[PDB]
């Protein structure tokens, strides 16, 4: 039953958050375990690629002091990717893929700007009362201020690097800094990288689905701009088009300052910043997965079959010389033959 | 409208055959052209892989004298594959594939025997009045009699070899000798080899469908024993399972002694020995197709897409480690995503 009894902030500052801050959905969820990084059960979950919330890693300890004012004064003046939207849902769009699907138009636009420019617009909406929404999603790089670099260096690289090694994972590919408005939502989708989700400011409700629930979440075609994202509108599920969504079961939890959520590769995750909970700041750690094992075991695992399906779609798209021919060939292949 | 006005046998011996000898089907058919091997229109059809009936090739001229008695006395005593069945339909079965589909049982059994043994059984049924059916399908080889070898050598290798060269086809892989009882039928299927179908004794109605009618003929899954054959019962079409069969359109013709039918690779063909027309004898010439062109043109041709679909099914079957998992993965891939 959900993310459990809201945790109590030390010092008798009351419940960190309350139920009325969570959105309502049609599916059931069990809690993701909250453990100590020293707890062998936590090492057990990660090794077996199952989610777990680590409470005491100190992964981004130096960032826990971060906020708009501090970051504005220390992040530098490089460009920051900022997505805008007229809805609480920030569906991701692959622009390199927007060529294929021509009659296509995003529900959220990307825009570059300096951090102070972002804070301005954030402020502009606030003091007037607008309905526009903004979500800053920018990779951390060479152009950040001196202090930010100091904080970054303070991250618990000893612990995470050891995690990287123990899992045989590839290299750290990036750290995405995410600053969003309360109520914002990143629709269900899966990533092809292992993720250590480090919460810094505010709270986020994280709903995860195992890879084996692929048939209940209906991802868009691989060549579509929204590849890897679910086509189901969690707020108004179309059970005629997506029958098996009625069978979807999730794992959820609410992360706050100091928590690190392990989002295993290929696991679906729906992420929302609690309603009326203020802005949120997160920093993730994306690592390329381990290489394919020298010996395959049968039957294959769910994430592997997902890998196979993705490949089939890619091969057909390239072979047919046109992505729009993938669907028809696929249907011709199964109709009256495999269904 | 069908195989046209029955041809008249030279010498005023009347119509070679009549309509009441043809079985009735639910679909329409246009006539395959009957031309002279010298007719450039015939060379045009073959080059463009479209069927054509050649009337004067003399391909198997020496065999036109063949019949059971002559062959029994001259074919030798090697073993001859003979398929038996309780129905006029002789569905082909790949035995190497019968391992996969376990709860499977053939509608026709194979049996080895000497030619004289075959003639005996053919005779046994005749003089009593039985309902059993036999179809001899045996590859021509090293163990045939001296006279048979003389006939074989008399084949018009000059003409066909030149055909092999002009089309860039691969090697001649075999010559299947087919002796069947009147009324026998080889259900619709396609072959992965170019074929020169040489009629020798009796008449055969040949119904062909272009590769682009794949979606109307519903072939069994590639790993199934009846791979490449249509699942539709031409005598009692299941329009609930095979809706698009209602859209199938064929090309037909009736071949007799001396005719050579070019069955282009991947073209579906339904072949029946006319009812009450006596036994039939045919000898085909199977050639590996030309190699894939150095430059692909888009969009692909129907037979190429058929090649792609077959491969996808093979890859998935081997990748999933079990052929029975192909269907489920395929359905999971398209349901709510591509259909």
């Amino acid at each position: 039953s959900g993310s459990g009894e809201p945790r109590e902030e030390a010092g008798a500052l009351g419940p960190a958050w309350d139920e009325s801050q969570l959105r309502s959905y049609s599916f059931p969820t069990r809690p993701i375990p909250r453990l100590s990084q020293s707890d062998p059960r936590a090492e057990e979950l990660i090794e077996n690629e199952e989610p777990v919330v680590l409470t005491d890693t100190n992964l981004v300890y130096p960032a826990l002091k971060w906020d708009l004012e501090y970051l504005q004064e220390n992040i530098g003046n490089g460009d920051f990717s900022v997505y805008s939207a007229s809805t609480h849902k920030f569906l991701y769009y692959d622009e390199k893929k927007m060529a294929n699907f021509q009659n296509f138009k995003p529900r959220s636009n990307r825009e570059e700007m300096k951090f102070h420019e972002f804070v301005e617009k954030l402020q502009d909406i606030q003091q007037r009362g607008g309905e526009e929404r903004l979500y800053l999603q920018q990779t951390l790089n060479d152009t950040v201020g001196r202090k930010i670099v100091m904080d970054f260096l303070g991250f618990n690289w000893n612990w995470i690097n050891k995690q990287q090694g123990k899992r045989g994972w590839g290299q750290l590919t990036s750290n995405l800094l995410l600053i969003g408005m309360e109520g914002n939502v990143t629709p269900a989708h899966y990533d092809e990288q292992q993720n250590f989700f480090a919460q810094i400011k505010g709270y986020k409700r994280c709903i995860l689905f195992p890879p084996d629930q692929f048939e209940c979440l209906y991802p868009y075609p691989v060549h579509h701009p929204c590849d890897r994202q679910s086509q189901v509108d969690f707020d108004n599920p179309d059970y005629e088009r997506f029958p098996n969504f009625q069978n979807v079961v999730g794992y959820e939890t609410v992360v706050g300052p100091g928590d690190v959520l392990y989002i295993p590769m290929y696991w679906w995750h729906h992420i929302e910043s609690l309603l009326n909970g203020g802005i949120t700041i997160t920093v993730n750690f994306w690592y390329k997965g381990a290489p394919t094992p020298k010996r395959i075991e049968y039957p294959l695992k769910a994430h592997q079959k997902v890998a196979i399906m993705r490949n089939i779609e890619k091969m057909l798209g390239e072979a047919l010389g046109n992505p729009q021919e993938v669907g028809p060939l696929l249907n011709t292949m199964i109709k009256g033959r495999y269904n | 409208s069908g195989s046209g006005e029955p041809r008249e046998e030279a010498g005023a011996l009347g119509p070679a055959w009549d309509e009441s000898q043809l079985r009735s089907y639910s679909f329409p058919t246009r006539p395959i052209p009957r031309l002279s091997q010298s007719d450039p229109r015939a060379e045009e059809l073959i080059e463009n892989e479209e069927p054509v009936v050649l009337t004067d090739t003399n391909l198997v001229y020496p065999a036109l004298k063949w019949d059971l008695e002559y062959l029994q006395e001259n074919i030798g005593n090697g073993d001859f594959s003979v398929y038996s069945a309780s129905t006029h339909k002789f569905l082909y079965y790949d035995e190497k594939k019968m391992a996969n589909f376990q709860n499977f049982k053939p509608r026709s059994n194979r049996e080895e025997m000497k030619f004289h043994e075959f003639v005996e059984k053919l005779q046994d049924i005749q003089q009593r009045g039985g309902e059993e059916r036999l179809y001899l399908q045996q590859t021509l080889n090293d163990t045939v009699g001296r006279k048979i070898v003389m006939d074989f050598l008399g084949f018009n290798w000059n003409w066909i070899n030149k055909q092999q060269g002009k089309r860039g086809w691969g090697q001649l892989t075999s010559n299947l000798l087919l002796i069947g009882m009147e009324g026998n039928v080889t259900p619709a299927h396609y072959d992965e080899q170019q074929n020169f179908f040489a009629q020798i004794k009796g008449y055969k109605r040949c119904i062909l469908f272009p590769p682009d009618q794949f979606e109307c003929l519903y072939p069994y899954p590639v790993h199934h024993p009846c791979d490449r054959q249509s699942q539709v019962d031409f005598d009692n079409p299941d329009y609930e399972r095979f809706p698009n069969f209602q859209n199938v359109v064929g090309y037909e013709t009736v071949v007799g002694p001396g005719d050579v039918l070019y069955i282009p690779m991947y073209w579906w063909h339904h072949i029946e020995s006319l009812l009450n027309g006596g036994i039939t004898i045919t000898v085909n010439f199977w050639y590996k197709g030309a190699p894939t062109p150095k430059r692909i043109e888009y969009p692909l041709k129907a037979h190429q897409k058929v090649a792609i679909m077959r491969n996808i099914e093979k890859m998935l079957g081997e990748a999933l480690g079990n052929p029975q998992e192909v269907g489920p993965l395929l359905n999971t891939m398209i349901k709510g995503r591509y259909n």
Partner: peptide, 14 residues
Amino acid sequence: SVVEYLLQHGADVH
């Protein structure tokens, strides 16, 4: 090799 071919995967993220 075919399985290995079909098991390979990209590294796409948001």
